[PDB]
């Protein structure tokens, strides 16, 4: 419940952090820059949801929650700014390939059963 609330601005809007010291953009946002650690100074940074497929897989037997989606595409997207994320791709099984340009979309990712909260976040859609 609380953990969704902390990363909403990241999941909804793709707002990460840029370390001024080395310039490397980080998404998901990081509290500490791994390369500069203590000397790093982080600022809020708005990413464009644009990126390309770096790798992918097709999940054929997922947990029961995803029964409507099965089989679905899961991928690691390399975003234009640098960071990579793990997310599903809204495209046909037979049109996913490495290097395909994609763009983030606000979607319903998960629901904590029928009584718990609904969690929203990013899913990627191809460009054409």
């Amino acid at each position: 419940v609380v953990r969704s609330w902390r990363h909403m601005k990241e999941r909804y809007n793709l707002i990460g952090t840029r370390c001024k010291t080395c310039g490397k953009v980080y998404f998901p946002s990081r509290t500490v820059c791994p390369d500069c650690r203590r000397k790093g100074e982080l600022e809020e940074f708005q990413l464009s949801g644009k990126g390309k497929i770096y790798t992918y897989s097709i999940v054929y037997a997922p947990p029961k929650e995803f029964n409507k989606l099965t089989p679905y595409v899961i991928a690691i997207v390399e975003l234009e700014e640098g960071p990579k994320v793990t997310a599903q791709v809204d495209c046909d099984i037979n049109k996913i390939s490495i290097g395909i340009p994609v763009e983030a979309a606000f979607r319903r990712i998960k629901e904590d059963g029928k009584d718990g909260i609904i969690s929203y976040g990013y899913k990627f859609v191809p460009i054409t």
Binding site: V1, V2, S4, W5, M8, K114, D115, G116, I117
Partner: protein, 347 residues
Amino acid sequence: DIGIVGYGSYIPKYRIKVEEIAKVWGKDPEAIKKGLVVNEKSVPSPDEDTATIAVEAARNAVKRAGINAEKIGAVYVGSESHPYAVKPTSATVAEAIGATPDLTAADLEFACKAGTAGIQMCMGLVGSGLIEYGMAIGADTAQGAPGDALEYTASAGGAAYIIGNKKDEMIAVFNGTYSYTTDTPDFWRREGQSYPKHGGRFTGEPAYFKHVLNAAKGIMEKMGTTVKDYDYCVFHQPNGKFYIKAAKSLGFTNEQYKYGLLTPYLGNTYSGAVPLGLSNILDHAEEGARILAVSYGSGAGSDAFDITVTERIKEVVDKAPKTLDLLNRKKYIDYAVYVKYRGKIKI
């Protein structure tokens, strides 16, 4: 120049004490009474629901305004317990007060802030010249889950406000309003479920206090005011403890916050909580009194108001029942009869 031309309240007659609920579930009533700062709560008759309570409050507001309901160009009902899932309460109220047909209406949802959201909507329509009068109501027949702590506070009530443009008929004037809103999963309910769920201690500092206090600070900055400029204050009051903590945090004394606090003997009426507390302030206030009103809704969000009372207040207070008269005209019931009335017994 926007103000309140009339206001009204309603509370049902049945009450149930903490002792009667704790007795059944095996809890120490004194610990609860002290922990929550609550003694008893209101209970609606089985022939009463959010609609009937809204009509009572709306009709009472019309009496104080002393106007022709045909003059009302919008009716907005904010609630959590609309009798239908899909059929507007607001229409039923408009018909029941004679406001139909020349008006717009909508049912409002935003946890316990729905009621004050409607006030702001009316302020806009009146200020813009789109309507001459608008009605904003906040009412609920809250239901607490039987075993849970919310059963000690979940009560029924409502209050209506008629907003207008004419100085001569204004009993109070809006100086300004401000709202603080984020996405916070502290309290929710899914369409299937009977009773809500919540994040326990997450409902406190990160949700209620964050929004209530940011909203309070915000309007005082917008208006350039300090706590000393206000004679009275009223905050959302899910229990007595939260209300007082917020009030003392901002620097208000007992004399300033006392009138707005009704939960200890009324319970938490959700979207009617602050509207009712504000109405008790108005039943007591004198010309020139300046009020700070801040509601809270889980979700989350708060609506702040900065209001000044005029000389016309004395003309209308006795035109309808006073909020404290309603609260003290009461009949006590035990837990068995309570769950019968509220429909808590599965049939």
